[PDB]
Amino acid sequence: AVVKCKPTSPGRRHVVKVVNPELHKGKPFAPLLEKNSKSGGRNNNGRITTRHIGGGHKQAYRIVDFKRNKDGIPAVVERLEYDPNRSANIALVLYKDGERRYILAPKGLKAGDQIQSGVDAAIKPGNTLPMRNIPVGSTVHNVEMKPGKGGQLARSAGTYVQIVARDGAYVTLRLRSGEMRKVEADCRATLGEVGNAEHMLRVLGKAGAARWRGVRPTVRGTAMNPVDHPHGGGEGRNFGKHPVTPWGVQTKGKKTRSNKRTDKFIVRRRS
Amino acid sequence: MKRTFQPSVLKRNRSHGFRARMATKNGRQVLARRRAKGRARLTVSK
RNA sequence: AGGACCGAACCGACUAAUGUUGAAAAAUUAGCGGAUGACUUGUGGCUGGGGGUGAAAGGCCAAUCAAACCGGGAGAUAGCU
RNA sequence: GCUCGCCGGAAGACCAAGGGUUCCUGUCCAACGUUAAUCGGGGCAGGGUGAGUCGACCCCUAAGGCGAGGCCGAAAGGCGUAGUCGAUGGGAAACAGGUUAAUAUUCCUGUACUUGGUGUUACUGCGAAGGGGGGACGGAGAAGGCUAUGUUGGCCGGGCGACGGUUGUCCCGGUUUAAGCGUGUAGGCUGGUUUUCCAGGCAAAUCCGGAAAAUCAAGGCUGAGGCGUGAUGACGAGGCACUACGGUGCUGAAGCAACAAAUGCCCUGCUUCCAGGAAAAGCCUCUAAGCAUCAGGUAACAUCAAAUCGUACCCCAAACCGACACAGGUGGUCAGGUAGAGAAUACCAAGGCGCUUGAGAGAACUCGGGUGAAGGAACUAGGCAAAAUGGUGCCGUAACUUCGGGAGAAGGCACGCUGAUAUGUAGGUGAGGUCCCUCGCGGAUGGAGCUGAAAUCAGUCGAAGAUACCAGCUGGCUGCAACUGUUUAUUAAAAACACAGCACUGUGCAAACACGAAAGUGGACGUAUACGGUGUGACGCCUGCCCGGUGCCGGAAGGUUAAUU
RNA sequence: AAUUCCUUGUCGGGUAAGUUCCGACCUGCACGAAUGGCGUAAUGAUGGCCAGGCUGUCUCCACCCGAGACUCAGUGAAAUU
RNA sequence: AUGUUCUAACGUUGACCCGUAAUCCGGGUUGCGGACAGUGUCUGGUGGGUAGUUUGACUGGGGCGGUCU
RNA sequence: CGCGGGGUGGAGCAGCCUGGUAGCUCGUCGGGCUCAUAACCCGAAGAUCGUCGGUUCAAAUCCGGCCCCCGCAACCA
Ligand SMILES: [Mg+2]
Ligand SMILES: [Mg+2]
Ligand SMILES: [Mg+2]
Ligand SMILES: [Mg+2]
Ligand SMILES: [Mg+2]
Ligand SMILES: [Mg+2]
Ligand SMILES: [Mg+2]
Ligand SMILES: [Mg+2]
Ligand SMILES: [Mg+2]
Ligand SMILES: [Mg+2]
Ligand SMILES: [Mg+2]
Ligand SMILES: [Mg+2]
Ligand SMILES: [Mg+2]
Ligand SMILES: [Mg+2]
Ligand SMILES: [Mg+2]
Ligand SMILES: [Mg+2]
Ligand SMILES: [Mg+2]
Ligand SMILES: [Mg+2]
Ligand SMILES: [Mg+2]
Ligand SMILES: [Mg+2]
Ligand SMILES: [Mg+2]
Ligand SMILES: [Mg+2]
Ligand SMILES: [Mg+2]
Ligand SMILES: [Mg+2]
Ligand SMILES: [Mg+2]
Ligand SMILES: [Mg+2]
Ligand SMILES: [Mg+2]
Ligand SMILES: [Mg+2]
Ligand SMILES: [Mg+2]
Ligand SMILES: [Mg+2]
Ligand SMILES: [Mg+2]
Ligand SMILES: [Mg+2]
Ligand SMILES: [Mg+2]
Ligand SMILES: [Mg+2]
Ligand SMILES: [Mg+2]
Ligand SMILES: [Mg+2]
Ligand SMILES: [Mg+2]
Ligand SMILES: [Mg+2]
Ligand SMILES: [Mg+2]
Ligand SMILES: [Mg+2]
Ligand SMILES: [Mg+2]
Ligand SMILES: [Mg+2]
Ligand SMILES: [Mg+2]
Ligand SMILES: [Mg+2]
Ligand SMILES: [Mg+2]
Ligand SMILES: [Mg+2]
Ligand SMILES: [Mg+2]
Ligand SMILES: [Mg+2]
Ligand SMILES: [Mg+2]
Ligand SMILES: [Mg+2]
Ligand SMILES: [Mg+2]
Ligand SMILES: [Mg+2]
Ligand SMILES: [Mg+2]
Ligand SMILES: [Mg+2]
Ligand SMILES: [Mg+2]
Ligand SMILES: [Mg+2]
Ligand SMILES: [Mg+2]
Ligand SMILES: [Mg+2]
Ligand SMILES: [Mg+2]
Ligand SMILES: [Mg+2]
Ligand SMILES: [Mg+2]
Ligand SMILES: [Mg+2]
Ligand SMILES: [Mg+2]
């Protein structure tokens, strides 16, 4: 649950941690791990292309099955696990034929539950179906955008999308952002919300807790010299200019989406 | 107090050695200039 | 348990005196701060000059930085000494 | 040579990097050495580095590099697939003693171990560029079991003391032994075995995964240390003989126990937490194609091989980086005694040094210290500097508070030595003896011996008992920043930067955004509880009015309006 | 007032005496609400002020111990002109 | 001119097969888009993101003020 | 020391720039409405334009001096 720390030191006073007693405590399942060394925000030129990234704890990548294309074979949840690479929890499932896989853990899932995918699967949380077989109004997560590609929407802790309408070859979805989007009705989705919905109640409490996650300090633009940022300079605290990014683009309101391929699929913007 | 030259044979050879010069056309041009001038010691390897 | 406490190694550099053709092109002596962490350190690697990197001082990039160093245009131009 | 002084968590001893003959011997003193020099890291000549087991090389990979084709680019070139490189990481094997002027885990002596080739014999399903297992991994914490190591006793050899005493509860010294091999213990993990079946492991699999029965309830793996052997050996105090006075030769006693004990080992363990903790090969196993009275595999024995390169010397330093024989910098390992919490500090051991100018004198003044009548901040920009406080145990402790703190608040009392309680206590350790059994490195009882605080009572010395070294000054009001952190290498450490938290805003994934003529890459093997930008800066109470100006967002009737025609 | 020129504003406290300090007043030259306002326990080699202790900081210096300075032997610079 | 439909250019950072021992690339099948997107030439807007420069003289020192025929 | 803007019925503001002419709101005075006051309705009065000089046929207006008022500036030093 959500647990407040007692203020036995100034770095502990404001810490709020979310602790799940039902997560596995041992090592992860070895056959489904790979390495992923860190970038530092640097691209193959060696230049920083995203700022404020670096350090943090070493992590190993869990191969999560986002496709759920093992149809008609029921699986049993073995245990829930912590995943360092994402905010949601992942479940280890065991298929009747002896294969093990990681999936995103939906809300309410627990060890011993039955899941399966395919067009004939039951309408229960954790089951994967093509969206043309799911009733209108259902709450789904891990939604595909192109059939067979793998789920791409609503993968963070506590998120979900809602199937608001179905008309022909397309279904209209309401995304967490509030955008109404049109998707092919043959794409797959998993029923229910993504678990670990209390992830957002966490409070880090100190600077080091953010450094443990590989976030480096952000220097404000007004704190620099004019040669460094459009906001720099001044005797004392001076601003006197319209806010911009480090590269001179207005940063409070100016819209940046420019993609005419996919404009046909957007029914309403998030507003 | 710590000075600027901290010797390391491996780093020396990998940075300025013969095979490092030969790997690019500008390094080869360095070697050509040094041969035309007539240096006895062409690189740091020797 | 802890960016917890006191305190050596280690990492720093707040005060004073000395030194200032120095023992030293930044130290010594006496005290001083941190000292399980946003810690420190070895080896190797990557980012290149209107570029990098910067918990941001216009700081650092080989005792050189409001634009490195080396070679060239080049005997730049100098109503000035 | 004899005294004296200094270091001793180094100013001792080793490794790595870096240097390259500085190493050792003979000889020389012009120049070099901040002086002289017969000396030297100086000059000249000669000598010196010995490996199947140490390291490299070798097999394997990380970050990263290069990169056939490929994609992209005026050219030069950029990126990248298959591959191939790249340790700071993974992978076979040796110890003790002796010896040189200078090398030694390399030479010699003794005793071992590893991998591979070949041959013979016996038995046999072998086979990979493929599958599976394994290698294989975090922080902190807590013990329990040990050893290195030390102390004391015993034993052995020697001593009987320059000045009162010293045949004894006296003094000095020694009391050492490895890898390997055999045992499989403290302890850690795990139920085992046999059948039958199966949408999984790109194909197959007897292997792994899964499912169902039957049966047994003990099997397996790992494991410091001890013990036995190695070893009737080697070493060994000290003697006895030469010395050509540096040392050579021979001989050689005891070689036990108890206690204490690591930051080392069991331990890559166990417990717990969240920030969730390399890869690939060697290795074990499974089969495919293929082969098939062969090949190949397993086992025993015999035999052969293990190449090449490094190895001197310095290595907190006069040999490395600092122009110097330069108060500087330089990664890892070892780690004795007494006191002590300690790797602090003081004095010492092993070991190593007295820092390459001296001799006098005893002015001012400068530097570094000691003491100071009476006063006690009057000094000064300012208590700068100095003086002072300083330990352990117990008693006691305010406002305020976010209930944790404040707090070591403040303040006080005890502290040495000797005796008794108790010829050494509570406690720790633990032999013999006895009794049991699945008999052993076993269990139970038993307590000799060893070690041993803390306290109380009594006495006693001094001016003073935390006696040295070491070791907080304390309180009150207030500005700023919440806090730990960071910063102008070399005049600024702060109220500046950061920060957890807050808000706005962009972004629907081929995301926005950034680096790039581009291909691509980062964001991210992430998906709006996510990511970027901007401002503010814990927490508490809050955050009022203005859209005229400038910007941004939306609108699209009307006016104006480019190329084009 | 880290903001107030006039200004050492005025009143109160502290002092024998206080341009600094603390508490108020409001006449805000020229505060003010996330270029945040007002508070705030704990923290600070942070700024200002007060007290106890303590002292050569001072009244006002004295003596002493060492390294130089001075003399002798050896070696032997420099800025400047 | 606008809209709707279609597929055959074009896109695909969907799936599957082959080169192949390959998450590049290419070829093939299929799905989804589809004359849109995107790119070339021309063109209007914006554009301190970047660049090259200008920013007078007299003057009882310069600036401010004043002046310049 | 220096620049810029102002002075108009009792109050606060126009009119100035393009010299021919003084407006607006409130206030004051007279009359209404009311039992009375306020509000409300009707009517009227009231400034020679800071002051002194110039230009002009004619000055609130344009020019100059002086007296007040306000704002800005007074830097490197
Ligand atoms: Mg960021
Ligand atoms: Mg932030
Ligand atoms: Mg700044
Ligand atoms: Mg700018
Ligand atoms: Mg300002
Ligand atoms: Mg402003
Ligand atoms: Mg701490
Ligand atoms: Mg400390
Ligand atoms: Mg620093
Ligand atoms: Mg400083
Ligand atoms: Mg110091
Ligand atoms: Mg502290
Ligand atoms: Mg500045
Ligand atoms: Mg520099
Ligand atoms: Mg320039
Ligand atoms: Mg020219
Ligand atoms: Mg010239
Ligand atoms: Mg000593
Ligand atoms: Mg020698
Ligand atoms: Mg001579
Ligand atoms: Mg000499
Ligand atoms: Mg020599
Ligand atoms: Mg690679
Ligand atoms: Mg490449
Ligand atoms: Mg090529
Ligand atoms: Mg290799
Ligand atoms: Mg290595
Ligand atoms: Mg030697
Ligand atoms: Mg022992
Ligand atoms: Mg050696
Ligand atoms: Mg010397
Ligand atoms: Mg030195
Ligand atoms: Mg160091
Ligand atoms: Mg010491
Ligand atoms: Mg003297
Ligand atoms: Mg003195
Ligand atoms: Mg004194
Ligand atoms: Mg005395
Ligand atoms: Mg006195
Ligand atoms: Mg006295
Ligand atoms: Mg005074
Ligand atoms: Mg005075
Ligand atoms: Mg002081
Ligand atoms: Mg003192
Ligand atoms: Mg103040
Ligand atoms: Mg602070
Ligand atoms: Mg500085
Ligand atoms: Mg991408
Ligand atoms: Mg701020
Ligand atoms: Mg003042
Ligand atoms: Mg007063
Ligand atoms: Mg006050
Ligand atoms: Mg302000
Ligand atoms: Mg506001
Ligand atoms: Mg603030
Ligand atoms: Mg601090
Ligand atoms: Mg002389
Ligand atoms: Mg000269
Ligand atoms: Mg410019
Ligand atoms: Mg030019
Ligand atoms: Mg001029
Ligand atoms: Mg009337
Ligand atoms: Mg008129």
mmCIF file of C-alpha atoms (C1' of nucleotides) in Angstrom, chain A residues 7 10 13-14 24 27 34-35 39 41-45 49-52 57-62 82 86 96-100 149 152-157 159 175-177 179 181 197 199-200 204-207 210 212-213 217-222 229 231 237 242 244-247 251-257 261-262 266 269-270, chain D residues 62-65 78-80 132-134 137-138 198-201 209-211 273-279 402-404 482-484 495-501 503-516 519-539 549-554:
data_model
loop_
_atom_site.group_PDB
_atom_site.id
_atom_site.type_symbol
_atom_site.label_atom_id
_atom_site.label_comp_id
_atom_site.label_asym_id
_atom_site.label_seq_id
_atom_site.Cartn_x
_atom_site.Cartn_y
_atom_site.Cartn_z
ATOM 1 C CA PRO A 7 10.993 11.809 9.850
ATOM 2 C CA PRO A 10 15.631 15.360 6.766
ATOM 3 C CA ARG A 13 10.574 13.283 6.194
ATOM 4 C CA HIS A 14 8.606 13.551 2.956
ATOM 5 C CA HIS A 24 7.979 -11.911 -5.826
ATOM 6 C CA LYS A 27 15.439 -13.466 -8.624
ATOM 7 C CA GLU A 34 18.760 -9.543 -21.547
ATOM 8 C CA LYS A 35 21.173 -6.755 -20.817
ATOM 9 C CA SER A 39 23.054 5.601 -23.035
ATOM 10 C CA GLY A 41 21.150 10.468 -23.441
ATOM 11 C CA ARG A 42 23.814 10.191 -26.144
ATOM 12 C CA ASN A 43 23.187 9.095 -29.723
ATOM 13 C CA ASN A 44 25.517 7.286 -32.102
ATOM 14 C CA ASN A 45 27.362 10.527 -32.802
ATOM 15 C CA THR A 49 20.476 14.589 -27.658
ATOM 16 C CA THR A 50 18.222 14.282 -24.618
ATOM 17 C CA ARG A 51 19.259 16.225 -21.558
ATOM 18 C CA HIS A 52 19.065 15.220 -17.896
ATOM 19 C CA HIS A 57 20.877 1.805 -10.935
ATOM 20 C CA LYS A 58 21.911 -0.966 -13.289
ATOM 21 C CA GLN A 59 18.940 -2.830 -14.771
ATOM 22 C CA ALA A 60 18.242 -5.963 -16.795
ATOM 23 C CA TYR A 61 15.591 -6.054 -19.499
ATOM 24 C CA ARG A 62 12.659 -8.417 -19.017
ATOM 25 C CA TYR A 82 8.833 -6.105 -10.106
ATOM 26 C CA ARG A 86 8.433 0.212 -16.546
ATOM 27 C CA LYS A 96 -0.411 -25.689 -20.572
ATOM 28 C CA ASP A 97 2.317 -26.794 -22.983
ATOM 29 C CA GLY A 98 5.159 -25.804 -20.671
ATOM 30 C CA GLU A 99 6.130 -22.362 -21.970
ATOM 31 C CA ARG A 100 6.647 -19.367 -19.688
ATOM 32 C CA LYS A 149 2.306 -5.385 -34.344
ATOM 33 C CA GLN A 152 1.298 0.133 -27.840
ATOM 34 C CA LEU A 153 -1.381 2.162 -26.031
ATOM 35 C CA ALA A 154 -2.218 2.140 -22.324
ATOM 36 C CA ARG A 155 0.826 0.341 -20.964
ATOM 37 C CA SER A 156 1.664 2.511 -17.962
ATOM 38 C CA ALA A 157 0.523 1.758 -14.445
ATOM 39 C CA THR A 159 -3.979 3.350 -17.529
ATOM 40 C CA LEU A 175 -7.210 7.389 -24.932
ATOM 41 C CA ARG A 176 -5.990 8.397 -21.484
ATOM 42 C CA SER A 177 -5.070 11.801 -22.889
ATOM 43 C CA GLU A 179 -8.033 12.047 -27.537
ATOM 44 C CA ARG A 181 -8.765 7.881 -32.038
ATOM 45 C CA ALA A 197 -2.650 2.141 -9.997
ATOM 46 C CA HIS A 199 2.197 4.213 -8.582
ATOM 47 C CA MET A 200 1.385 7.919 -8.862
ATOM 48 C CA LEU A 204 10.501 10.533 -3.878
ATOM 49 C CA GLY A 205 11.410 12.730 -0.932
ATOM 50 C CA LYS A 206 14.979 13.705 -1.787
ATOM 51 C CA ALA A 207 17.327 14.501 -4.645
ATOM 52 C CA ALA A 210 15.715 10.936 -8.417
ATOM 53 C CA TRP A 212 18.793 6.607 -8.469
ATOM 54 C CA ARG A 213 16.481 6.559 -11.479
ATOM 55 C CA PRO A 217 19.729 17.977 -12.524
ATOM 56 C CA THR A 218 17.881 20.547 -14.633
ATOM 57 C CA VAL A 219 19.400 24.028 -14.733
ATOM 58 C CA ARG A 220 16.881 26.807 -15.296
ATOM 59 C CA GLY A 221 17.326 28.926 -18.385
ATOM 60 C CA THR A 222 17.228 32.170 -16.421
ATOM 61 C CA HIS A 229 20.151 30.106 -23.374
ATOM 62 C CA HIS A 231 16.709 33.323 -21.198
ATOM 63 C CA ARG A 237 16.780 38.343 -11.592
ATOM 64 C CA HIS A 242 8.632 35.373 -23.985
ATOM 65 C CA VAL A 244 11.198 29.615 -25.221
ATOM 66 C CA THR A 245 13.096 26.339 -25.359
ATOM 67 C CA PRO A 246 16.901 26.237 -25.375
ATOM 68 C CA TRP A 247 16.657 26.397 -29.174
ATOM 69 C CA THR A 251 7.303 26.824 -25.109
ATOM 70 C CA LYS A 252 3.943 27.860 -23.597
ATOM 71 C CA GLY A 253 1.105 26.991 -25.984
ATOM 72 C CA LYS A 254 2.730 26.676 -29.400
ATOM 73 C CA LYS A 255 1.584 23.402 -30.938
ATOM 74 C CA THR A 256 4.209 21.115 -32.440
ATOM 75 C CA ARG A 257 2.324 18.201 -34.000
ATOM 76 C CA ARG A 261 -0.273 10.762 -42.573
ATOM 77 C CA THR A 262 -2.137 10.016 -39.373
ATOM 78 C CA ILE A 266 -7.640 11.504 -35.101
ATOM 79 C CA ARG A 269 -7.669 16.246 -30.117
ATOM 80 C CA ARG A 270 -7.156 15.914 -26.383
ATOM 81 C "C1'" A D 62 31.839 -5.477 -21.986
ATOM 82 C "C1'" A D 63 31.856 -0.246 -23.196
ATOM 83 C "C1'" G D 64 33.598 0.976 -27.623
ATOM 84 C "C1'" G D 65 36.167 0.475 -32.480
ATOM 85 C "C1'" G D 78 28.933 8.991 -42.785
ATOM 86 C "C1'" C D 79 26.251 4.947 -40.653
ATOM 87 C "C1'" G D 80 25.667 -0.064 -40.217
ATOM 88 C "C1'" G D 132 18.976 -27.038 -22.518
ATOM 89 C "C1'" G D 133 21.710 -26.473 -17.801
ATOM 90 C "C1'" G D 134 25.732 -23.951 -15.774
ATOM 91 C "C1'" C D 137 26.830 -11.637 -10.426
ATOM 92 C "C1'" G D 138 23.119 -5.553 -5.818
ATOM 93 C "C1'" C D 198 2.413 -33.679 -23.992
ATOM 94 C "C1'" A D 199 -0.241 -27.498 -28.860
ATOM 95 C "C1'" G D 200 6.587 -25.769 -25.581
ATOM 96 C "C1'" G D 201 12.429 -25.238 -26.391
ATOM 97 C "C1'" G D 209 9.802 -27.442 -19.388
ATOM 98 C "C1'" G D 210 4.791 -29.303 -18.350
ATOM 99 C "C1'" A D 211 0.924 -33.213 -16.679
ATOM 100 C "C1'" C D 273 15.460 -3.690 1.579
ATOM 101 C "C1'" C D 274 14.395 -1.344 -3.039
ATOM 102 C "C1'" A D 275 17.062 1.871 -6.390
ATOM 103 C "C1'" G D 276 15.830 -4.800 -8.421
ATOM 104 C "C1'" G D 277 21.702 -5.742 -9.137
ATOM 105 C "C1'" A D 278 27.286 -7.828 -17.129
ATOM 106 C "C1'" A D 279 28.228 -10.808 -21.361
ATOM 107 C "C1'" U D 402 6.987 19.125 11.408
ATOM 108 C "C1'" C D 403 6.560 14.989 17.760
ATOM 109 C "C1'" G D 404 11.789 12.729 14.945
ATOM 110 C "C1'" A D 482 14.040 24.295 4.093
ATOM 111 C "C1'" C D 483 17.437 20.363 4.674
ATOM 112 C "C1'" U D 484 22.540 16.430 2.649
ATOM 113 C "C1'" A D 495 21.808 34.672 0.330
ATOM 114 C "C1'" A D 496 24.298 31.957 -5.804
ATOM 115 C "C1'" C D 497 23.283 26.517 -8.645
ATOM 116 C "C1'" A D 498 20.777 21.973 -7.544
ATOM 117 C "C1'" C D 499 16.935 19.713 -4.899
ATOM 118 C "C1'" A D 500 12.259 16.733 -3.383
ATOM 119 C "C1'" G D 501 7.405 19.187 -4.160
ATOM 120 C "C1'" A D 503 2.108 24.593 -11.919
ATOM 121 C "C1'" C D 504 1.754 25.689 -17.054
ATOM 122 C "C1'" U D 505 2.573 23.735 -21.719
ATOM 123 C "C1'" G D 506 3.869 20.479 -25.861
ATOM 124 C "C1'" U D 507 3.649 15.236 -27.259
ATOM 125 C "C1'" G D 508 -1.180 9.369 -29.864
ATOM 126 C "C1'" C D 509 4.158 6.831 -31.286
ATOM 127 C "C1'" A D 510 7.457 6.488 -37.663
ATOM 128 C "C1'" A D 511 5.617 11.027 -30.547
ATOM 129 C "C1'" A D 512 7.192 15.951 -29.506
ATOM 130 C "C1'" C D 513 12.320 17.164 -29.209
ATOM 131 C "C1'" A D 514 17.750 16.786 -30.337
ATOM 132 C "C1'" C D 515 22.376 15.299 -33.339
ATOM 133 C "C1'" G D 516 22.830 14.735 -38.499
ATOM 134 C "C1'" A D 519 20.954 7.207 -44.128
ATOM 135 C "C1'" G D 520 20.332 6.787 -39.388
ATOM 136 C "C1'" U D 521 20.603 7.381 -33.879
ATOM 137 C "C1'" G D 522 18.969 9.147 -28.908
ATOM 138 C "C1'" G D 523 13.940 9.844 -26.594
ATOM 139 C "C1'" A D 524 12.915 4.121 -25.590
ATOM 140 C "C1'" C D 525 13.349 -2.021 -26.655
ATOM 141 C "C1'" G D 526 9.490 3.588 -23.060
ATOM 142 C "C1'" U D 527 3.478 4.542 -24.675
ATOM 143 C "C1'" A D 528 -0.102 10.111 -21.427
ATOM 144 C "C1'" U D 529 0.360 7.313 -13.743
ATOM 145 C "C1'" A D 530 4.966 8.310 -20.166
ATOM 146 C "C1'" C D 531 8.421 11.633 -22.279
ATOM 147 C "C1'" G D 532 10.248 17.014 -23.471
ATOM 148 C "C1'" G D 533 10.394 22.365 -22.371
ATOM 149 C "C1'" U D 534 9.612 26.483 -19.084
ATOM 150 C "C1'" G D 535 9.015 28.897 -14.362
ATOM 151 C "C1'" U D 536 8.708 28.346 -8.987
ATOM 152 C "C1'" G D 537 11.413 25.773 -5.104
ATOM 153 C "C1'" A D 538 10.534 21.250 1.659
ATOM 154 C "C1'" C D 539 6.361 22.176 4.899
ATOM 155 C "C1'" G D 549 0.024 46.799 -25.208
ATOM 156 C "C1'" U D 550 3.355 42.361 -26.718
ATOM 157 C "C1'" G D 551 3.108 37.051 -27.391
ATOM 158 C "C1'" C D 552 0.374 32.587 -27.968
ATOM 159 C "C1'" C D 553 -4.298 29.778 -29.075
ATOM 160 C "C1'" G D 554 -8.932 29.580 -31.971
#
